Write a protein that binds this ligand. Structure first.
Ligand SMILES: [Cu+2]
Ligand SMILES: [Cu+2]
Ligand SMILES: [Cu+2]
Length: 639
């Protein structure tokens, strides 16, 4: 199931209008409080007008609207199930602006929701752009509009949430498809559940920021239910998805061809493991006792060139285990892994003990000391986040999490870890005064300016329960060693939520739940627009444009020359991200040293060390004097 975020508005005095309505299936049948009566567009009768079809509601007075629900006909007939759709709000009834929510609802008879940030409005319009099975009709048994207890305008300067993207699945895992700019998402064998899976199948969905279209695809060719997986983008530009519901499987997603390809089985069956792309484009993984058995699961490594996994039994998981009260089942999960120099992988947590993993020979592991600071030794931080916001300087920001996977209080702990050479114990200090809000199951992304956006989570980890939620995201600004609260959102994003950086410089945050009949499934995402995209007016700022790039594929140590439509102050490369269960081992940021050629022509060198400039796809962002980023230019980095 799912749920509205607001309270149902009384429909007593509502006036409604439809684009068409069969007799017996009048427009007002959608607001009569009877689940057995529904509005239905023209059929047979006045023919079969194809969608879009439109439901417009005049609520007579201004409401602080924060959602709608749509109950499909309940008579066993699928005709008119709304697929693609948009929700508009209005204060006058003629000026509708842009949708507050849009996307696609799953093809079934369950109540569908559009949950979105509160906005005062008197009119609400639902546009059914397509029918879920591609037929001409739209039908609705009951439509409801929901309200918040109050409205508060977003504070100027603190970003903006919206719109909502409605989805057919709970996006518990996600990745950007770097060649197409689409967001790829997946759940499990079902749109809303993983339990009872027979394995072998994954429901996926994608959203295209350029068209606003949400599509779906069932993946069976890889014989892999990809819930609870490792995820890495390898050096050959493919997303390596490992284990989970099918604990020994590897599936490969190729962005260029938009296809899934079977990969080799891993040597050890795993679930909830982290994997990390390495300096040579290979992928390392370790731990993962959520599935495939509970025992010591030491490292192994994937080669995109030979298409094999090779066990690294001496890359021992033991030193990275947390002291989780549930034992090994949890304690080897979700390692904070980062590919680093010379095939090494740094493990920054969640265990108090940090470690170097080495991938030569049959592998090795070396203590990198305890995550700590003058405030003391950091405790285990399961489902804390870790983000490498300046790979050139080896800077990792870690934050949040709890000593145990669940039933454990999260903390505000945050550290800056500074990597040097593999095998040296990195310096660690506390980050500012820590998070504003203690959170676990939160998610995070590094933004083009090197700040880290941190969102969602709850104060006490209770999977599938929307309790103690944190609605106010925070951004860490490294140059200031300061966290800043941003404008809060209205949708709980706890266990099984994701965030990713979009090519346009906005953040895509979604998911949460995946518990079947629970009411805590969130079939959606929202966009967060950082303040760097807004002018002091409150309007979207003019963005510098990259009018020319010398090349779209570059070797590490290689030069790129660009032209812009205006003077550039700073530039960064942000490696494309992948996300699930708080883990994102693919994102990282390289601040770029620009040479000004004059005439708004600039050049820069990609770092020569592929442990820093991990091979794969990266976004190039340029920022003007005002600090406004361009949209990303996609660059492939190779060795
Ligand atoms: Cu899970
Ligand atoms: Cu977690
Ligand atoms: Cu975790």
């Amino acid at each position: 199931a799912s749920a509205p975020i607001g309270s149902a508005i009384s429909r007593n005095n509502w006036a409604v209008t439809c684009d068409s309505a069969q007799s017996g299936n009048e427009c007002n049948k959608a607001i009569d409080g009877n689940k057995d009566t529904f509005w239905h567009t023209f059929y047979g009768a006045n023919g079969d007008p194809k969608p879009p079809h439109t439901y417009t509601i005049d609520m007579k007075t201004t409401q602080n609207v924060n959602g709608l629900s749509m109950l499909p006909r309940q008579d066993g007939n699928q005709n008119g199930w709304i697929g693609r759709h948009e929700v508009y709000l209005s204060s006058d009834g003629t000026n509708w602006g842009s949708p507050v929510a849009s996307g696609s609802w799953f093809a079934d008879s369950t109540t569908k929701y559009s949950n979105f940030e509160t906005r005062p409005a008197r009119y609400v319009r639902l546009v059914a752009i397509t029918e879920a099975n591609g037929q001409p009709w739209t039908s609705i048994a009951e439509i409801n509009v929901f309200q918040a207890s109050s409205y508060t305008a977003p504070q100027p300067g603190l970003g903006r949430w919206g719109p909502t993207i409605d989805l057919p699945i709970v996006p518990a895992a996600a990745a950007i498809e770097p060649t197409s700019g689409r967001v790829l998402m997946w759940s499990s064998y079902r749109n809303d559940a993983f339990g009872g899976s027979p394995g072998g199948i994954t429901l996926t969905s994608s959203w295209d920021p350029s068209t606003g279209i949400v599509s779906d695809r069932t993946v069976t060719v890889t014989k892999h239910d990809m819930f609870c997986p490792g995820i890495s983008m390898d050096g050959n530009g493919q997303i390596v998805v490992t284990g989970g519901n099918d604990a020994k499987k590897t599936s490969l997603y190729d962005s260029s061809s938009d296809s899934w390809i079977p990969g080799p089985d891993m040597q050890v069956a795993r679930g909830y493991q982290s994997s990390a792309t390495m300096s040579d484009g290979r992928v390392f993984t370790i731990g993962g006792s959520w599935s495939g058995g509970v025992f010591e699961k030491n490292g192994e490594v994937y080669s995109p060139s030979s298409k094999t996994w090779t066990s690294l039994p001496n890359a021992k998981v033991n030193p990275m285990l947390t002291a989780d009260k549930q034992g090994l089942y949890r304690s080897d999960n979700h390692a904070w892994l980062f590919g680093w120099k010379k095939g090494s992988v740094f493990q920054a947590g969640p265990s108090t003990a940090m470690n170097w993993y080495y991938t030569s020979g049959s592998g090795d592991v070396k203590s990198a000391g305890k995550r700590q600071s003058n405030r003391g030794v950091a405790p285990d931080a399961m489902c804390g986040n870790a983000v490498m916001y300046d790979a050139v300087k080896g800077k990792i920001l870690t934050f949040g999490g709890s000593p145990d996977y669940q039933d454990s209080d999260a903390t505000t702990n945050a550290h800056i870890i500074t990597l040097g050479e593999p095998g040296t114990s990195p310096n660690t200090v506390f980050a500012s005064n820590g998070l504003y809000f203690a959170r676990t199951f939160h998610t995070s992304v590094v933004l083009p300016d090197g700040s880290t956006f941190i969102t969602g989570g709850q104060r006490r980890g209770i999977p599938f329960e929307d309790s103690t939620p944190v609605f106010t995201p925070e951004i860490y600004v490294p140059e200031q060693d300061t966290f800043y609260k941003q404008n809060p959102n209205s949708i709980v994003r706890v266990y099984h939520s994701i965030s990713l950086l979009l090519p346009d410089g906005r953040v895509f945050n979604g998911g949460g739940g995946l518990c079947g009949d629970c009411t805590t499934n969130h079939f959606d995402a929202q966009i967060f627009t950082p303040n760097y995209l807004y002018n002091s007016n409150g309007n979207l700022a003019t963005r510098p444009k990259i009018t020319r790039t010398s090349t779209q594929s570059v070797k590490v140590g290689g030069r790129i020359t660009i032209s812009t439509d205006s003077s550039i102050s700073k530039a960064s490369l942000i490696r494309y991200g992948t996300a699930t269960h708080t883990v994102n081992t693919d994102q990282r940021r390289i601040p770029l040293t620009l040479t000004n050629n004059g005439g708004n022509s600039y050049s820069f060198q990609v770092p020569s060390d592929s442990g820093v400039a991990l091979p794969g796809y990266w976004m190039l962002f340029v920022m003007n004097s005002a600090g406004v980023p361009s949209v990303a230019s996609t660059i492939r980095v190779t060795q």
